[PDB]
Design a protein around this ligand. Structure first.
Ligand SMILES: [Mg+2]
Lengths: 1212, 134
DNA sequence: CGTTTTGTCTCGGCTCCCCGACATTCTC
DNA sequence: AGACAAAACG
């Protein structure tokens, strides 16, 4: 009879909901509720998640975290270098004096920026290595370049000199820190590729293109030759860009089995491709036959203008740096005794590893060379273990009792599919599933070739020896051939055939000098474990050699065979090893099968089943299936399902169906939901908010009472993912426990389709209601445009229908410009009974009569459907006109964070490494505190600075975007002069003047545009801006960094009122909010400087009510008599800046037309949002607005007698 | 160089002459124009009217005299209650003492002079209590 | 003061866990 | 590409 129907419409970031109490048989009913919950998301996210471009906050956070981690580890390396050098007594005294070595080890003393080589005496900085500088000047004079060079270039001269000459120890420390600065490229795995691995960057010229007579696509493809005598692998069509062209490729050569190079080709662009640039630099350095340091030094001797960092050497293999540093250290160890003092080596080891005796002892066998390169500078940590994240077996658990007196379950991790046990399991499964067919008559020819256990033993024996099987091999096995038979699987497909043992046996065969019985099952498992667990080159070789020693095998060809074993692919099975070991005995047959190999419980179950006795753990379906398993010997060659049931007693996964009896179950489900559990964050957010809204509706309209919701309908309108998961989760609320309702989804869940929704909407006139609702916006747009193209008269209905001109019809849709259409769709869905969906999804009847009954019951006479009840249109209009859109808010600023770090704790007289928690209150800032660009502060006398504003200058590249107006914003005046002169010489056209060719010409001839006075080349210029930028920090040089507020961080907008009545407005910076919330205070100060009391603070997505001009809302309240007029005066905050706060009416989703700088028109002017109301009064919203509070279901909250009473009733 | 505040007990010891040395010390503090919190003034008024039963007229006149010439009242800070709640979790004192400390700190007071507040204790790394009479 | 315009950190390598969609064979 | 935050323009 009476049915509560809940219709849901789910969008990408919107949730429309409707709840109705319908009595369809009597054509009665009424709309109990309607609404829409909105999750704010920028259009960029909506347009990017379709294609996918790092569309995730979590990914961005991880990126920042990785950057920070690299920075911190570099700092740690520097500090350890400082400590070691200070103990070694190498640092200069003035430098060492400013470094803490007692509490903050190795770090610089607070508010200090010491420089190793520049000594500050009475405010004057002097270079430390004068004689080395003189030597470098002598070398430069010999090269005949110039005698005036920066002092810091001496680093490279020392780097060259250290290779074969003695240098001062301070110079060595400078060199070592310089090496620490630049480490180079390196890959953890290594795995030196093809010995040739040519990968040589070469530049070739095309000699000729003999048309190869390869006519393709109505054109004959030409070949290519290179002066070296090489033919391009690929053919060419466009001859213009190939003839006698100097191209550069990255060619790979491999010695083919025939004994010749299989040269490949790959086109690259130097100075644009990472690999090309890197390989070119590596080849250039190698050809010089000298270390990178001296290469840089000589390139600097030849061209004193050379850019080194970022231009000459960007990135190169770490081997270059390691070799140079090893050479330098080895040479200097011959001169400085401190590098040979074992006492000093021990002292440094204790300094670094006072609490790690094991590592101390290990290092005691090494020397300073190893300590400097291998342990300090070039130590790269290995990857973290991901084994903890592996899935868990669905069958085997363990139970244990913790210190809390509870009994909880530990899980068993799945088995790596490379495991021999899994290989055997898979091979047996494939064997059982195999069955042959004859080509001619397609009959089940099997049972004639695999009919006795001997045949199956033969097949298993054959399969073991292989690593893969195919049609031909399997057919040939039985002596059968292709021309008559097939094997029931993909005729041309191959299947895994125990490749693990194969490869192991093949590499064991190549070793020779061993009897052909060494490889036993136990040895096979041991070898697989060795290969799988020791994933490290040095560790792997040591393990190999050790294994070859313990087993009396000559370790000469063994490691050669196994040193290049391909690592196993990362993939795991459904079950663990324990379950597979249990299931194999049942699956095996023949000599591989033996009764004693079945565990005690499974043997007991076997005895029970053969006996036919009664056990509660054995179902009737069992004896139905196990009728044939009369005797123990029938327990052979059992398929997966039979053995699974026998071992564990469940016919696979039977599910639990479940049923929630109240909102408590749903809220528990929500509480225990895990993050990142679904496809992507967007669907997860939508689903979780949908569940929360459903819980709120349940509590409000049914008190969470059991089976309150008679039926739930769902619609979506990529997004398909949330179609089935949500239905499955919500089946727990609308299920029936009588046994009739069984399946993946409850029969009461009735997914719809767009066809039913649209056809109901058109037949039911809800389209007319929507058009009427949205029309006033279209008359407003008409007035704004002073035209009549946004509204079209129609005579069939004798009214204006909204419309848009063709030029503004790119992607316009009348529905998406609001938030209430979601609720309209929800309402439409909620009244669509199962009959409607069946009728409109299977309208094909095969006979008019059988579906005529549904036609009559649901369609007026087939023209239109009957309304759910007489006043449906009126009710829908009245409800839709009174829907407040509820917006989710994210106002996180600070949140507590927990830090656990490794540390040596002293317990029971022993030092043991464990994770200690960080003490004190450590907050985590949950917003970006500032934009990334950092600008310096400048004072230009020739520009006026109004009080409260400052000038900040940042470097910019000189390009075509520099006109006279822009050229007027450069801090330097000589640059302004030269740029103006150059631009004038170029007809005042920046496109021509400041093109790369123009810039090159200008740098060549800077004399002619600077009165003939010389001038350094110009590549970047500091442009200034006048504004309000705050310092990044307050320590060190951070006071010299000025930044702007990050996007979407003006979250608070304070409104105060003085005794008189006038209002004051302010925007609180995120920083001030951070301190205020850290102190336990409110985000917004409760009083301004003038002492005006704080009326309230506004944040984005907050809802305010703007009273009419005549209305005097001072103590109004009474927020229950909300009619269309009142709701029509509800606005939502969008953005804030200074004293400006922008608003958009709550029911507006997308503008009819946005703003374009050319036409200069928009629904809400240039900002796509207004500081004033859209109505003709056009009143300042902030001048008379009053904040309101709405819940998830869009009901306003206002203090009441009961509310006040409860406020301190809770405390009573 | 350091803003200095006082509690009721300082002015009471000034007002009391049973203890010549302590009265002298308290008067010595007052020669430095120390800051003070309005709640100190109100509590002083209450104690004056209850323990000493002094006339309302005389107490008001002395309050006006001291606030005009010797000490400086501190404007009540609207963030006193929120901060006091913040201080309560980490600090277990009388809510009156917590309020006094809250207002003193909110006014950048660097030293608070009092006895019954566990002398030498630092409140949120911003204000160290000093016991002067020792 | 009210409105529009403008600028906004960017690029490389590699490995190891998880989920889902679609196909194929088999079983219940 | 998008939309905020603020300079910049009247
Ligand atoms: Mg007190």
């Amino acid at each position: 009879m009476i049915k509560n129907i809940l219709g849901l419409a789910l969008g990408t970031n919107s949730i429309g909901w409707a709840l109705v109490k319908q009595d369809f048989e009597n054509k009665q009913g009424e709309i109990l509720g309607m609404g829409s919950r909105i999750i704010p998301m920028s259009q960029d996210i909506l347009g990017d998640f379709g294609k996918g471009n790092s569309v995730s906050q979590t990914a961005e956070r991880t990126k920042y975290r990785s950057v920070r981690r690299l920075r911190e580890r570099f700092l740690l390396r520097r500090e350890r270098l400082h400590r070691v050098l200070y103990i070694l007594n190498f640092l200069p005294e003035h430098y060492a004096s400013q470094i803490d070595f007692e509490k903050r080890l190795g770090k610089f003393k607070v508010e200090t920026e010491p420089k190793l080589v520049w000594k500050n005496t009475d405010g004057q900085f002097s270079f430390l290595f004068q004689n080395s500088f003189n030597e470098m000047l002598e070398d430069f004079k010999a090269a005949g370049q110039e005698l005036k060079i920066p002092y810091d270039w001496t680093i490279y001269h020392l780097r060259k000199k250290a290779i074969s000459q003695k240098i001062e120890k301070e110079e060595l420390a400078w060199i070592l820190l310089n090496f620490n600065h630049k480490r180079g490229y390196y890959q953890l795995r290594g795995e030196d590729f093809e010995e040739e691995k040519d990968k040589t960057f070469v530049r070739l010229k095309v000699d000729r293109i003999v048309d190869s007579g390869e006519n393709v696509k109505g054109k004959i493809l030409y070949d290519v030759y290179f002066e070296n005598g090489w033919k391009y692998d690929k053919q060419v069509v466009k001859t213009e860009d190939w003839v006698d062209r100097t191209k550069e490729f990255i060619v790979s050569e491999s010695i083919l089995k025939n004994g010749e190079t299989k040269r490949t080709f790959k086109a690259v662009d130097s100075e644009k491709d990472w690999i090309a640039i890197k390989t070119k630099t590596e080849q250039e350095i190698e050809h010089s036959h000298k270390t990178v340091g001296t290469y840089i030094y000589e390139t600097l001797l030849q061209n004193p203008k050379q850019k080194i960092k970022g231009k000459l050497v960007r990135t190169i293999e770490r081997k270059f740096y390691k070799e140079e540093l090893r050479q330098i250290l080895e040479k200097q160890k011959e001169f400085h005794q401190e590098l040979q003092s074992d006492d000093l080596y021990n002292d440094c080891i204790r300094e670094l590893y006072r609490n790690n005796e094991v590592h101390q002892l290990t290092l005691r066998k090494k020397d300073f060379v190893h300590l400097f390169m291998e342990d300090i500078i070039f130590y790269q940590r290995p990857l973290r273990s991901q084994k903890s994240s592996v899935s868990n077996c669905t069958l085997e658990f363990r139970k244990y009792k913790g210190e809390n007196g509870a009994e909880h379950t530990q899980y068993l991790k799945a088995i790596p599919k490379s495991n021999p046990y899994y290989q055997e399991f898979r091979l047996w499964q494939w064997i059982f599933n195999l069955n042959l067919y004859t080509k001619d008559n397609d009959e089940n020819v099997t049972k004639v070739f695999l009919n006795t256990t001997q045949d199956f033993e033969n097949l298993f024996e054959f399969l073991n020896t292989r690593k893969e099987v195919d049609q031909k091999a399997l057919l040939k096995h039985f002596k059968l051939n292709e021309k008559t038979h097939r094997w029931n699987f993909v005729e041309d497909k191959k299947y895994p055939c125990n490749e693990t043992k194969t490869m192991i046996s093949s590499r064991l065969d190549k070793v020779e000098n061993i009897s052909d019985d060494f490889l036993t099952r136990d040895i096979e498992q041991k070898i697989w474990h060795i290969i799988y667990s020791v994933n490290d080159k040095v560790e792997y070789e040591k393990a190999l050699k050790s294994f070859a020693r313990k087993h009396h095998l000559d370790e000469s060809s063994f490691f050669e065979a196994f040193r290049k074993f391909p690592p196993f692919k990362s993939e795991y099975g459904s079950f663990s090893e324990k379950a597979i070991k249990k299931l194999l005995p049942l699956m095996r047959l023949g000599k591989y099968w033996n009764y004693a190999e079945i565990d005690k419980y499974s043997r007991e179950r076997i005895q029970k089943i053969i006996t036919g006795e009664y056990d509660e753990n054995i179902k009737d379906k069992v004896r139905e299936k196990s009728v044939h398993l009369t005797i123990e010997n029938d327990f052979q060659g059992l398929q997966l399902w039979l053995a699974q049931y026998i071992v564990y007693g469940r016919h696979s996964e039977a599910s639990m169906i479940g049923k929630w009896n109240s909102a408590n179950d749903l809220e528990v489900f929500l509480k225990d939901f895990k993050q990142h559990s679904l496809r992507n964050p967007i669907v997860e957010q939508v689903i979780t908010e949908t569940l929360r809204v459903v819980k709120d509706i349940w509590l409000k309209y049914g008190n969470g009472t059991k089976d309150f919701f008679n039926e739930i309908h769902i619609e979506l309108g990529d997004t398909r993912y949330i179609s089935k998961y949500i239905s499955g989760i919500l089946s727990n609320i609308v299920r029936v426990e009588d046994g009739s309702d069984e399946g993946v989804n409850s029969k009461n869940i009735v997914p719809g389709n767009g066809k039913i929704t649209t056809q109901l909407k058109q037949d039911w006139g809800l389209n007319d209601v929507w058009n009427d609702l949205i029309l006033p916006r279209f008359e407003r747009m008409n007035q704004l445009t002073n035209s009549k193209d946004f509204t079209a008269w129609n005579e069939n209905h004798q009214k204006f229908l909204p419309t848009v001109p063709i030029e503004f019809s790119k992607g316009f849709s009348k529905k998406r410009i609001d938030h209430r259409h979601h609720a309209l769709d929800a309402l439409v869905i909620a009244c669509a009974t199962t009959d409607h969906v069946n009728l409109l999804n299977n309208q094909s009847a095969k006979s008019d009569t059988k579906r005529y009954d549904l036609k009559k019951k649901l369609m007026k006479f087939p023209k239109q459907f009957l309304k759910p009840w007489e006043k449906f249109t009126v009710d829908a209009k009245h409800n839709l006109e009174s829907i407040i859109v509820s917006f989710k808010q994210n106002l996180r600023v600070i949140n507590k964070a927990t830090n656990y770090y490794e540390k040596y704790v002293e317990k029971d007289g022993t030092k043991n490494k464990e994770r200690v928690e960080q003490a004190g209150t450590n907050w985590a800032i949950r917003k970006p505190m500032h934009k990334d660009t950092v600008s310096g502060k400048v004072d230009l006398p020739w520009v006026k600075v109004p009080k409260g504003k400052i000038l900040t200058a940042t470097r910019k590249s000189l390009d075509s975007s520099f006109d006279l107006k822009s050229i007027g914003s450069i801090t330097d005046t000589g640059i302004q002069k030269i740029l103006k002169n150059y631009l004038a010489f170029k007809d005042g056209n920046p496109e021509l003047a400041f093109s790369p060719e123009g810039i090159d010409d200008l740098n060549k001839n800077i004399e002619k545009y600077n009165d003939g006075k010389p001038h350094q080349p110009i590549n970047k210029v500091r442009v200034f801006e006048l504004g309000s930028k705050f310092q990044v920090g307050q320590t060190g040089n951070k006071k010299g960094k000025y930044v702007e507020a990050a996007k979407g961080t003006n979250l608070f907008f304070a409104v105060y009122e003085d005794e008189k009545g006038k209002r004051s407005y302010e925007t609180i910076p995120l920083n001030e909010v951070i301190e205020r919330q850290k102190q336990g205070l409110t985000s917004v100060p409760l009083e301004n400087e003038k002492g005006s009391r704080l009326l309230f603070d506004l944040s984005p997505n907050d809802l305010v009510y703007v009273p009419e001009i005549d209305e005097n809302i001072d103590s109004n309240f009474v927020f229950s008599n909300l009619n269309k007029e009142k709701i029509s005066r509800i606005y939502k905050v969008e953005k804030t800046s200074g004293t400006e706060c922008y608003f958009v009416r709550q029911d507006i989703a997308y503008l009819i037309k946005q703003y374009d700088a050319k036409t200069k028109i928009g629904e809400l002017e240039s900002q796509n949002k207004l500081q004033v109301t859209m109505t003709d009064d056009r009143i300042r919203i902030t001048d008379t607005c009053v904040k309101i509070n709405c819940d998830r279901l869009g009901n306003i909250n206002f203090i009441t007698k009961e509310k006040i009473k409860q406020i301190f009733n809770e405390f009573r | 160089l350091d803003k200095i505040a006082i509690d009721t007990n300082i002015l009471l010891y000034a007002y009391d002459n049973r203890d010549l040395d302590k009265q002298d010390r308290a008067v010595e503090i007052l020669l430095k124009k120390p800051f003070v919190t309005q709640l100190v003034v109100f509590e002083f008024i209450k104690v004056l009217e209850r323990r000493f039963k002094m006339d309302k007229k005389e107490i008001t006149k002395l309050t006006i005299k001291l606030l005009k010439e010797v000490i400086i009242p501190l404007s009540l800070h609207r963030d006193i209650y929120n901060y006091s709640q913040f201080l309560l979790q980490r600090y277990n004192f009388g809510l009156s003492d917590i309020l006094v400390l809250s207002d003193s700190i909110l006014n950048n007071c660097t030293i608070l002079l009092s006895e019954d507040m566990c002398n030498g204790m630092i409140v949120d790394k911003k204000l160290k209590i000093v016991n002067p009479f020792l």
